[PDB]
Subunit: 242 residues, 3 copies
Amino acid sequence: AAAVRENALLSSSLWVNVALAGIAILVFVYMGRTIRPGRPRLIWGATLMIPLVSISSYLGLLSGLTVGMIEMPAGHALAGEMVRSQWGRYLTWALSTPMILLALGLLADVDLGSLFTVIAADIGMCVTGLAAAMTTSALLFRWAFYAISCAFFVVVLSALVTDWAASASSAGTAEIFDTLRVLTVVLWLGYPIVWAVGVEGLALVQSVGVTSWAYSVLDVFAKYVFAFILLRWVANNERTVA
Amino acid sequence: AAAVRENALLSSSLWVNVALAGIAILVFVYMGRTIRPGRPRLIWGATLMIPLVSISSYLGLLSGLTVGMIEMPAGHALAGEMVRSQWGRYLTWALSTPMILLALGLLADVDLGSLFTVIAADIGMCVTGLAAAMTTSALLFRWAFYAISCAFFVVVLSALVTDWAASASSAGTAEIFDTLRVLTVVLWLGYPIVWAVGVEGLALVQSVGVTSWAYSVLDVFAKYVFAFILLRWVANNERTVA
Amino acid sequence: AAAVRENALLSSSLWVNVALAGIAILVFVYMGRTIRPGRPRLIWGATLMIPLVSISSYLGLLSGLTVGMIEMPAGHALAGEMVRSQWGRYLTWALSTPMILLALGLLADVDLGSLFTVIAADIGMCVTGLAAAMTTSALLFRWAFYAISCAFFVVVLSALVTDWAASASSAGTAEIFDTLRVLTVVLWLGYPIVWAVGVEGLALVQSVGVTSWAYSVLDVFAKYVFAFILLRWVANNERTVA
Ligand SMILES: *C/C=C(C)/C=C/C=C(C)/C=C/C1=C(C)CCCC1(C)C
Ligand SMILES: *C/C=C(C)/C=C/C=C(C)/C=C/C1=C(C)CCCC1(C)C
Ligand SMILES: *C/C=C(C)/C=C/C=C(C)/C=C/C1=C(C)CCCC1(C)C
Ligand SMILES: CCCCCCCCO[C@@H]1O[C@H](CO)[C@@H](O)[C@H](O)[C@H]1O
Ligand SMILES: CCCCCCCCO[C@@H]1O[C@H](CO)[C@@H](O)[C@H](O)[C@H]1O
Ligand SMILES: CCCCCCCCO[C@@H]1O[C@H](CO)[C@@H](O)[C@H](O)[C@H]1O
Ligand SMILES: [Cl-]
Ligand SMILES: [Cl-]
Ligand SMILES: [Cl-]
């Protein structure tokens, strides 16, 4: 009907990324066999962690381990209903987005003070997003947590468009950093946009299947494709980095 | 009566810090507009994270997300009763007290070996404190976990009064470190004192409202005021740090 | 009978490590009184954290805090039954095995890029192992999570047998690193072997008592004895390290 249909959107959006993460793992391992030790191999190891965390996350959601029903508060578009929350996505973003930040930070050769603060701000972003999805008592707190999460996000992007970009400029990865950083701000902006537009925020799109697929498509560009671009440039520019 | 009264203590002690953390965020952002890039801006970014974690924590407790009832074991002063545990406080101390340690560690220019161990010992302190509050099976374990937590605390203070202080002495922040470190050991000693004296330990003070307010007052000095002192000295001593 | 017997295996395997961890703490503190500041004292502090995390973990399992019943999926050897899962072991490995990696990384003087990736891969190993034990919906996911965990394990061992070993060779701890790294790969291989052979995997050994004792014996060599060897060599080689 539309529950046949809704359950077919959900499972396919999970199984596709279990597949592509696994392939990405296999491709990145293959690519590491051609990379010289040093700062190259160190970026490769951090990058390989991105799809390994990702496949664990989708196995988490698929196995039911990291999914639950959350009752939506009054004034929510779906007030009084139990929607299935893919809260495992927030959990695993917490370990996967620092992996990305570690790769970008190694590439740009950022200072470690900056690295810790960004990864800390990034873990803040992820966790308050989880609080936003888990909050049932009042609609106000759901968006309060959303706004606070955006504040951490703003700290993460600010450090990239300034401090880390400056560091890549004096590390000789200035150009490749520009591309990944353009790619990071555009795709990462998609997630709070999917949150607001979709079932958990405004619920202008009410399918849990659809918003799940939106996240899954974002995961394709922000994890696997992003990672693939990084490694390819690295295997082609091993002097500039080491 | 006294439940009117008890619920008025609890909500005010949460809402006050949601307010002051938010103001502190606004004030620290304002203050960052005058700070030169380098080690100054890096201390500022770490410091700004302190009240952003704090407002998320109080929103967590206020929204009911991170509060539960814990049945107290036999021999507890309130044996057989369900007290409301603000366990969200332990959770968030785990992410906020490393922020403080990061700021103090950047300021003193500590070695990274020391930084990791302290933050690890500090996360140990926080987590076993949570275990102490969550344990229901026996009073012995509650204080066992308490004592172990104090052992991590002792590791954290030892590194500050020696290794990090020595590092600040050869970093030229020797004096400002002295003040913050005096301020840190005094206020941080308050938390295990509030734990023992209040409802969760000995329960010589049995109000959950009151012990919550005690923590909230400690949070005012150990997060916002502490942070405000750091930033002010930094905006006045930007050569010494960079 | 055999539940008298089974509950006697479980409690003794927990209480023995609460005892030996506590003794180990006392012995390592004593040993730190003779260690010179610098890279020596920094390895000592990281090492002391190993048994302090360990005693908290066993107090967690003993107090019932971090133990639950998991219903085993169809096709499991114990399909349809509730076995007691010592999931607290996975939780605490997550904070204790980075402590070990920190000590080995300080000793070998590894690069910080390598340190973060290994500790990240190691936390991945631990967490997906927990997912493996917690998964109830299907036997496939339990071993899927197992295989993914082994992939992180493989990343951790690879970095040790190459990158960190190379770093110890140019740090002068080349020899002591060889011994600890031989000791680490052998003992760490025991844990996924106990997982597969014991109640949670294949259940060729079905006692929860017995598999718990297997883990406890592994904890004796991989935490306390390992740590004791490190400190002894350090107190005897303080020039080579500093
Ligand atoms: C690979 C996964 C990535 C890069 C995920 C990024 C996720 C975010 C940038 C999430 C952002 C959110 C906000 C900024 C507001 C609150 C809701 C969130 C958590 C979706
Ligand atoms: C901003 C929040 C801060 C600085 C919190 C500090 C918390 C502590 C120092 C907690 C200490 C505790 C012990 C030492 C014993 C067990 C109970 C605790 C967790 C309250
Ligand atoms: C002190 C505790 C230590 C060193 C524990 C190490 C644990 C492991 C190496 C666990 C390995 C596992 C796998 C590789 C597969 C999945 C099951 C685990 C988590 C037992
Ligand atoms: C991007 C942030 C804009 C939204 C900020 C908070 C909006 C208040 O909340 C929203 O109000 C609407 C009223 O029916 C509902 O449709 C939504 O489900 C609800 O989340
Ligand atoms: C600062 C640590 C001192 C206390 C150590 C453990 C004390 C044992 O426990 C205490 O015993 C009392 C007996 O009624 C009770 O009032 C307390 O509620 C209980 O926690
Ligand atoms: C080391 C990994 C080898 C096992 C891989 C997955 C094995 C499938 O699973 C196993 O099948 C058996 C059939 O009865 C059962 O005895 C086990 O309990 C079950 O876990
Ligand atoms: Cl993820
Ligand atoms: Cl906090
Ligand atoms: Cl452990």
